[PDB]
Design a protein around this ligand. Structure first.
Ligand code: GDP
Ligand code: CL
Lengths: 338, 15
């Protein structure tokens, strides 16, 4: 029984832990046996509404409540923002929902790329009344949307067609500088995950570096590290659903953040899905080609790009089936010449 | 002290 160690890399919030959770759904017991719980969904709900409310005053220009009657709801939300051991009483759900229906709050949500907001904000805020029920058991999709910070390595071990896989994410791990290279030991392939839709956002670590440029810089560092030169990279251009939504909305144009997009044309090898808007096709291949330029500019490793939606179990099932074929057939490239 | 992956990847000071 061959075992393949698969190392998930990528910037924070690109989708690495979601891929692990998807592997567990597909090939282990899902969220059934430190898994994401109801409480994490309530915490995300609270973090979303309190982040949006607090951001209203700080934007330039600032955003006001559309309904000044909701001011006491704002006072409540900000007052419990950092409360340890929040009990989520019924008035919290009342104020959160009523604030989510305030046009000023939504206008602030629409400008979320100007601050730091978790991805699942609208998804959870739109089902406040479902979540607050005492009988509420979260669906797998609820648990996939729930952003939970990993402490330590986040991993899954599973067997498919008599082939063992060990997929692990080191996003929540820290190590001594000279020992970090050891995390790549005996790795069959790196799975590099990119939040394609985050081209208009900046990273939390400094609130200045553009998120996509951060992903390109990370990918460049891995790709050109001579001690990793024999490890092939499977590239997950993730959050395709959020990329399509953002492009079709025209609020943040890609060329406003990556000016060469204005001169980019969709390649002729492109396989746009039927019905895909041409702007979305050009965007997603541009982002792909931003990484492919790095991997072509400089060994015994290749890059295999994939368009993915990490919260879509069926999408990841398909993509991972392609990866297993890529993974089980990577050894064949060792026998090729030139 | 201990550094993150990006501190390693970009040779940033631990801080
Ligand atoms: N709409 C959408 N949301 C995603 C996708 N992938 C991740 N999300 C979310 O993005 C958030 C952060 O993803 P996570 O796996 O925790 O990022 P990590 O820091 O790289 O592990 C989670 O709320 C995930 O549900 C995607 O493909 N589409
Ligand atoms: Cl990213």
């Amino acid at each position: 029984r061959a075992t393949h160690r698969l190392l998930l890399l990528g910037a924070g919030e690109s989708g690495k832990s979601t891929i692990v959770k998807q592997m567990r759904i597909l090939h282990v017991n899902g969220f059934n046996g430190k898994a994401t719980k109801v409480q994490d969904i309530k915490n995300n709900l609270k973090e979303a509404i309190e982040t949006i409310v607090a951001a209203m005053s700080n934007l330039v220009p600032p955003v006001e409540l559309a309904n000044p009657e909701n001011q006491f709801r704002v006072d409540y939300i900000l007052s419990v923002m950092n409360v340890p051991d929040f009990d989520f009483p019924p008035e919290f759900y009342e104020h959160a929902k009523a604030l989510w229906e305030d046009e000023g709050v939504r206008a602030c949500y629409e400008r979320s790329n100007e601050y730091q907001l978790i991805d699942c904000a609208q998804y959870f805020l739109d089902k406040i009344d479902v979540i607050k029920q005492a009988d509420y058991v979260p669906s797998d999709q609820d648990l996939l949307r729930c952003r939970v910070l990993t402490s330590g390595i986040f991993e899954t071990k599973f067997q498919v067609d008599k082939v063992n896989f060990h997929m692990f994410d080191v996003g929540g791990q820290r190590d001594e500088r000279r020992k970090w290279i050891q995390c790549f030991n005996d790795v069959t392939a790196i799975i590099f995950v990119v939040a394609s839709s985050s081209y208009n956002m900046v990273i939390r670590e400094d609130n200045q570096t553009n998120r996509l440029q951060e992903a390109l810089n990370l990918f460049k560092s891995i790709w050109n590290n001579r001690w990793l030169r024999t490890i092939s990279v499977i590239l997950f251009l993730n959050k395709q659903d959020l990329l399509a939504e953002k492009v079709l909305a025209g609020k943040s144009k890609i060329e406003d953040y990556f000016p060469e997009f204005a001169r980019y044309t969709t390649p002729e090898d492109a396989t746009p899905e039927p019905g895909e808007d041409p702007r979305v096709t050009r965007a997603k291949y541009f982002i792909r080609d931003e990484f492919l330029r790095i991997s072509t500019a400089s060994g015994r490793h290749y890059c295999y790009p994939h368009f993915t939606c990490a919260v879509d179990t069926e999408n990841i099932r398909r993509v991972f089936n392609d990866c297993r074929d890529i993974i089980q057939r990577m050894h064949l490239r060792q026998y090729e010449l030139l | 002290x201990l550094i993150t992956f990006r501190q390693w990847a970009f040779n940033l000071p631990c801080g």
